[PDB]
Amino acid sequence: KVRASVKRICDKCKVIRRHGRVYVICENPKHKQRQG
Amino acid sequence: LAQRLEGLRGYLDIPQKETRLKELERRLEDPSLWNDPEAARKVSQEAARLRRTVDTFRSLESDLQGLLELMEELPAEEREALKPELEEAAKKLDELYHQTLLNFPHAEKNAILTIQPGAGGTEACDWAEMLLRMYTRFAERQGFQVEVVDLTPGPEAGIDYAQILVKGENAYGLLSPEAGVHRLVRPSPFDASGRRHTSFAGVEVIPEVDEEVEVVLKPEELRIDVMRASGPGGQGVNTTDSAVRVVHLPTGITVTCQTTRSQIKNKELALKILKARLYELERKKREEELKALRGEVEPIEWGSQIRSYVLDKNYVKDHRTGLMRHDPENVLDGDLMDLIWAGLEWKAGRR
Amino acid sequence: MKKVVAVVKLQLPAGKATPAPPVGPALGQHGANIMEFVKAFNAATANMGDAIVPVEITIYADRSFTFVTKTPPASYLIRKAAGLEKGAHKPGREKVGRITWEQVLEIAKQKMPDLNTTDLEAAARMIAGSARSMGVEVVG
RNA sequence: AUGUCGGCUCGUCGCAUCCUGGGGCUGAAGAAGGUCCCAAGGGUUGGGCUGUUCGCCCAUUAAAGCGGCACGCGAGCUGG
RNA sequence: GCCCGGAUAGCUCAGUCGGUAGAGCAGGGGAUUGAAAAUCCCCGUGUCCUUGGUUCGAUUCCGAGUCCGGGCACCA
Numbered sequence: 001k002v003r004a005s006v007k008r009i010c011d012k013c014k015v016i017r018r019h020g021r022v023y024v025i026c027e028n029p030k031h032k033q034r035q036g
Numbered sequence: 037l038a039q040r041l042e043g044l045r046g047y048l049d050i051p052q053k054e055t056r057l058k059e060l061e062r063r064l065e066d067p068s069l070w071n072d073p074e075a076a077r078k079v080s081q082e083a084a085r086l087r088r089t090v091d092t093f094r095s096l097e098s099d100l101q102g103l104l105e106l107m108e109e110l111p112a113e114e115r116e117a118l119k120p121e122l123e124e125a126a127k128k129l130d131e132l133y134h135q136t137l138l139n140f141p142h143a144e145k146n147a148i149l150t151i152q153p154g155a156g157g158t159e160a161c162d163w164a165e166m167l168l169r170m171y172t173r174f175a176e177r178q179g180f181q182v183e184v185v186d187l188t189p190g191p192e193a194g195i196d197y198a199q200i201l202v203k204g205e206n207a208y209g210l211l212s213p214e215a216g217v218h219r220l221v222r223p224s225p226f227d228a229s230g231r232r233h234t235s236f237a238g239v240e241v242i243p244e245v246d247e248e249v250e251v252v253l254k255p256e257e258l259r260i261d262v263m264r265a266s267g268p269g270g271q272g273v274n275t276t277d278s279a280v281r282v283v284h285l286p287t288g289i290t291v292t293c294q295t296t297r298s299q300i301k302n303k304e305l306a307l308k309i310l311k312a313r314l315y316e317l318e319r320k321k322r323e324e325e326l327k328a329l330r331g332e333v334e335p336i337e338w339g340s341q342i343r344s345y346v347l348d349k350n351y352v353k354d355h356r357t358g359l360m361r362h363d364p365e366n367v368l369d370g371d372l373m374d375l376i377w378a379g380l381e382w383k384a385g386r387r
Numbered sequence: 388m389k390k391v392v393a394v395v396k397l398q399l400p401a402g403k404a405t406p407a408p409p410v411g412p413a414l415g416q417h418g419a420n421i422m423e424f425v426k427a428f429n430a431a432t433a434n435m436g437d438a439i440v441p442v443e444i445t446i447y448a449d450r451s452f453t454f455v456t457k458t459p460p461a462s463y464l465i466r467k468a469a470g471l472e473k474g475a476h477k478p479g480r481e482k483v484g485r486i487t488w489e490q491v492l493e494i495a496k497q498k499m500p501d502l503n504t505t506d507l508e509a510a511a512r513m514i515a516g517s518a519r520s521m522g523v524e525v526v527g
Numbered sequence: 528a529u530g531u532c533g534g535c536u537c538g539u540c541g542c543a544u545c546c547u548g549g550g551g552c553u554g555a556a557g558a559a560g561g562u563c564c565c566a567a568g569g570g571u572u573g574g575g576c577u578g579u580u581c582g583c584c585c586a587u588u589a590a591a592g593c594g595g596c597a598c599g600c601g602a603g604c605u606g607g
Numbered sequence: 608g609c610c611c612g613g614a615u616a617g618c619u620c621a622g623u624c625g626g627u628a629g630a631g632c633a634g635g636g637g638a639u640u641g642a643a644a645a646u647c648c649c650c651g652u653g654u655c656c657u658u659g660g661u662u663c664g665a666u667u668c669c670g671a672g673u674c675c676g677g678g679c680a681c682c683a
């Protein structure tokens with residue numbers, strides 16, 4: 001969810017960068033990552 | 037043993053329960069929660085293996101004179117084709133029968149018999165010593181490393197205590213039914229007029245298990261507060277958190293310490309105590325467990341025996357099962373493999 | 388490997404067959420007869436032999452089926468070919484038993500009607516490999 | 528000569544949030560929870576024991592938060 | 608934590624300038640006894656705690672270490 005190292009966990013997960021913040025979106029919500 | 041093994045296994049019972057397995061098995065009733073599936077086939081194999089049992093029986097029954105032709109014809113092959121399926125058979129005959137008995141928790145461990153002389157004072161102290169030589173020789177010739185723990189040679193005769201290790205496999209599972217009271221009737225070699233008196237004894241048996249001693253406590257396992265100590269000290273005692281307090285959350289046991297002026301050395305002494313008092317609750321439960329492994333019986337007085345031994349009427353009546361041999365002398369020297377199986381059969385019966 | 392409609396392949400032994408463990412629910416779950424199969428099966432097993440016939444059965448609403456029989460797994464013909472009970476646990480190094488460049492060819496003949504490679508060297512190959520598949524080196 | 532613990536009185540600031548307001552996950556059915564995020568506006572009880580801070584306990588509560596202020600506050604008090 | 612004193616047979620303990628090793632007890636084999644005790648002959652086993660060093664050699668003389676025994680840890 002929220003952390004320092006936001007990486008990938010699928011073959012299905014984009015490294016979206018919105019609002020200076022590096023988020024991470026995947027099909028399954030368990031992979032919804034943000035950085036903080 | 038060999039001819040009888042069958043019956044007492046659910047010989048006719050199991051072969052009816054067997055299809056009860058597959059019974060509810062088929063028809064996948066919304067196979068949700070996983071449960072019988074596990075003990076589904078494993079319990080099944082048991083079944084049709086009573087045939088492998090009647091095949092190694094038939095192959096070993098059709099073997100009674102399965103050499104009447106080998107008593108008339110020695111060289112051939114039409115007589116050496118079922119044999120490589122007959123040597124292996126006399127093997128499973130024993131297997132599927134003693135692998136149905138020893139079928140319980142931890143038996144393959146090295147055992148630890150203990151002999152304490154019941155009533156009869158000195159007689160019992162001797163009868164005890166005899167019961168010692170017994171299992172010893174037995175386990176000895178039985179291919180078992182026997183290590184002598186204790187031997188307290190009592191007052192006038194015999195012993196008062198004895199404890200020995202039984203190094204081997206299923207040693208416990210074997211010398212397990214022995215655990216219990218053993219009576220002895222014969223004229224007292226000690227009594228004056230060689231009169232006839234009865235002797236009693238206690239023989240406990242347990243598996244070797246614990247070898248190490250670890251008692252480390254994770255930080256989260258506890259809690260540590262710190263406050264201003266109570267006592268002498270002027271400005272000091274007043275403005276310092278020298279007083280510690282370790283609390284072990286699980287047990288709830290807590291320890292406090294203001295021994296020295298150092299919050300630090302006080303945590304130290306603190307835990308030092310905490311540990312000490314934790315092993316005490318660790319050994320208090322470390323034995324209320326292993327002691328409930330002795331049994332729930334044996335008052336070691338009269339009428340508690342589970343197999344008596346007589347010598348002026350040569351026999352040995354096992355009260356537990358009912359069995360009664362006529363060779364006390366042989367039993368007391370090794371002969372046990374007979375009553376050990378039976379002893380189990382009786383027991384394992386209820387599990 | 389033809390058409391598909393709730394099919395369910397599975398291997399079976401000699402005449403022995405019906406125990407729920409191997410089969411039983413194996414086809415009874417997809418609604419079918421353990422009856423019209425327990426015997427219907429031993430109608431062709433008793434005829435060809437008594438080993439292990441890979442029979443894949445298809446199913447329809449009429450609890451119907453089309454149990455197509457094939458040659459025993461190339462893993463069987465290779466075993467007895469050297470007298471081995473089990474496989475070998477960890478292959479690639481321990482050759483519990485072994486087979487010859489010919490003994491392999493024999494079997495190849497026995498399964499060539501199932502494969503898709505007429506040639507007898509082509510077939511024998513995907514067999515000689517079946518050795519490295521269970522620790523049974525090829526003699527050659 | 529910069530009066531030292533706790534209590535009382537008076538507070539105020541922080542957020543690393545105990546309630547209450549929002550929100551993402553969940554091994555979230557629902558009601559309940561768990562974990563992380565946002566968010567101090569306002570709230571955060573009465574007692575038994577001990578000089579106690581700290582704790583334990585009784586009876587509750589939405590919750591009975593953790594700190595900084597010369598471990599705030601003795602030219603404001605107490606003085607166990 | 609500091610500073611003293613320890614560890615030697617199965618238990619409790621001596622011992623030497625550096626070569627050696629002991630006592631009482633328990634324990635084993637015998638003897639009286641009807642049978643035990645007591646008593647009476649015969650007995651033996653030890654790295655002298657660990658690990659370094661000095662010496663030609665260390666139980667022994669020094670460094671260190673572990674466990675146990677004492678004594679102190681005070682002014683605020």
Ligand SMILES: [Mg+2]
Pocket residue numbers: 153196
């Ligand atoms: Mg006694």
Ligand SMILES: [Mg+2]
Pocket residue numbers: 188197
């Ligand atoms: Mg004792």
Ligand SMILES: [Mg+2]
Pocket residue numbers: 268269
């Ligand atoms: Mg003072």
Ligand SMILES: [Mg+2]
Pocket residue numbers: 275276
């Ligand atoms: Mg201070």
Ligand SMILES: [Mg+2]
Pocket residue numbers: none
């Ligand atoms: Mg002034």
Ligand SMILES: [Mg+2]
Pocket residue numbers: none
């Ligand atoms: Mg926040």
Ligand SMILES: [Mg+2]
Pocket residue numbers: none
């Ligand atoms: Mg809910």
Ligand SMILES: [Mg+2]
Pocket residue numbers: none
């Ligand atoms: Mg009050």
Ligand SMILES: [Mg+2]
Pocket residue numbers: none
């Ligand atoms: Mg009071």
Ligand SMILES: [Mg+2]
Pocket residue numbers: none
């Ligand atoms: Mg405050």
Ligand SMILES: [Mg+2]
Pocket residue numbers: none
């Ligand atoms: Mg103050």
Ligand SMILES: [Mg+2]
Pocket residue numbers: none
């Ligand atoms: Mg005063």
Ligand SMILES: [Mg+2]
Pocket residue numbers: none
């Ligand atoms: Mg006063």
Ligand SMILES: [Mg+2]
Pocket residue numbers: none
């Ligand atoms: Mg000593």
Ligand SMILES: [Mg+2]
Pocket residue numbers: 627
């Ligand atoms: Mg000498």
Ligand SMILES: [Mg+2]
Pocket residue numbers: 630
């Ligand atoms: Mg002496």
